[model samples]
Target chain A: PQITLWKRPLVTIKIGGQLKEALLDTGADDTVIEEMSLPGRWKPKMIGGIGGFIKVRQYDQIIIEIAGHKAIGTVLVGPTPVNIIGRNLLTQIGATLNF
Target chain B: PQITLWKRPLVTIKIGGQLKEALLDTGADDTVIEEMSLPGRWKPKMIGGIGGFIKVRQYDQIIIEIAGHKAIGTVLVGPTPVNIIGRNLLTQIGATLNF
Candidate 1:
């Protein structure tokens, strides 16, 4: 599917049995979700962005649905200012940069 | 072209006789450059994001060359933490979100 950037590409995603909106950030190396609860063990991870380094919980083998496409990957839960869906999940669905 | 999520899509751009790298951010609404001077009059504007509202100089009629594609549009210059190529210029180059 194709989406024109009339605005920020904020898309709905189903994860952890809840639906949330996330920005499709190609600039982000990992998917960072706003502080949330997940079932499973997580490892401590740090991520650097436009601001700087931030601590996040790396949860593995998590299921996420983006625009009806399902993908299983690592999800970082933490105190992110925003929910960003990065390329880890974007590649799972074969996303492209088109012009 | 297809871009994977393995890394951030930071691409080189040519503007104002200089080449610089900028993050291909689908999340940012407007293109913002970290403190640059352009050869034209600009209007003062404010933009908001994860951090907060930031004041900028909105320069129109500025030509930006990205990945060999040329586009003329509004370019905001200010004390931004990062150089972001946002939807404004992305759409000018016919960019779309796909998977």
Candidate 2:
């Protein structure tokens, strides 16, 4: 089966207590918020994995309004080196890509 | 103590069975390869979290040689949307950023 990939325009998000624009990726499974972009009291816990473990913290909830749809989900507080959107958010919103 | 953020040069990686260049982010806690760039048989499983579960698949130990140092670790297989290099690889190699 061929999977579809979609890249949405850069959307602004609150990171490190500041609003920044980020591209919404439906193909991603998790909601990755940049460490530099996150505000106060966003301490993440470490999640174990195969290679090692990733530091993952929980947030109250972020209201993401996209494509005329709105969904509230907890954000993944990751380090400042890399930011991404993963499968966690993808399955929650039930998003579909139209080519 | 204040955290340091480093942005490495874009390096080439294989995704969706093809090689492509991507930026190495030390601040990130995981290594994310684009779905469009990966090769075959990259199946991932779903990992649970606070917001929801993330689809995480295992790789047969990728050998990454950087800065005259080499480390072997399992790669995180994810869907195509955003590419990232997170902390898993950073701690494995004991990386430090020189600002």
Candidate 3:
């Protein structure tokens, strides 16, 4: 599937048995989602985003379903305004930036 | 051209008569560049990115060349860690997200 750039590239994703919307962000280095309780332990971490930097909880080996495709990787939990699917997950789903 | 998510999608761009590298960020709503002097009366503005929100100077009608493609739009100059070619500019270059 191809998504045009005329609008925000928001897509449905399933994580922790809950459905959520996330952006397919090629600009972000890591996947950051809204704070949610997961089964495993997460370490406090700081990551740089479009604005400046923010503190987040890093969870590893999380499985997410994006647009019906499954992807497993490290997911970050934090106070992000929006959920972001970065390169880590994008690669797993074989997402690409094309022109 | 299709860009895979295996690596950072950084590309060379011409802005303000200078050449610099920027990330082709589909996750960002607006184009933001590192703080630099540009010609025109720019207004103070703020935009949210992956991290959070930051203050920026918005300059309209700025021309940027991305991968040999030219685009004119509003470009924000601020204290961003990296120059980002957001959706505003990505649209001009006919960039899209695909899987």
Chain A fold similarity by TM-score, each prediction: 0.95, 0.50, 0.96
Model 3: what is its DockQ? Answer: 0.81
Question: Over the stretch B1-96, how does candidate 2's per-residue lDDT look in tens digits?
Answer: 111222223445544435555544432445665444433345666533223446666665676543334556656766523455444554554543
**Sliding window of 10 residues with minimal summed lDDT for model 2 chain B:** B1-10
Reference interface contacts recovered per candidate: 0.64, 0.00, 0.92
Candidate 3 is scored at a TM of 0.96
User: Residues A1-99, candidate 3, lDDT per residue (tens digit)?
Assistant: 999988999999999999999999998788999988878788899998766678999999999999999999999998887999999999998888988
Please provide, for model 3 over B1-99, each residue's C-alpha lDDT reduced to its tens digit, 9 standing for 90 to 100.
888988899999999898999999998888889988788779999887666788999999998899889999999999988899999999999999989
Off by over 4 Å in 3: none
Rank ordering of all candidates by TM-score, starting from the highest: 3, 1, 2
Per-residue lDDT, model 3, residue A79, is 88
- Docking band of candidate 1: medium
lDDT of each: 0.83, 0.47, 0.90
- Model 2 misplaced regions, further than 4 Å: A1-99, B1-9, B14-18, B36-43, B47-53, B65-69
Kindly list the per-residue Cα lDDT of model 2 for residues A1-99, writing each as its tens digit: 122221223444544445556544432345666654444455557643223456776675666543334556767766533344444554444533221
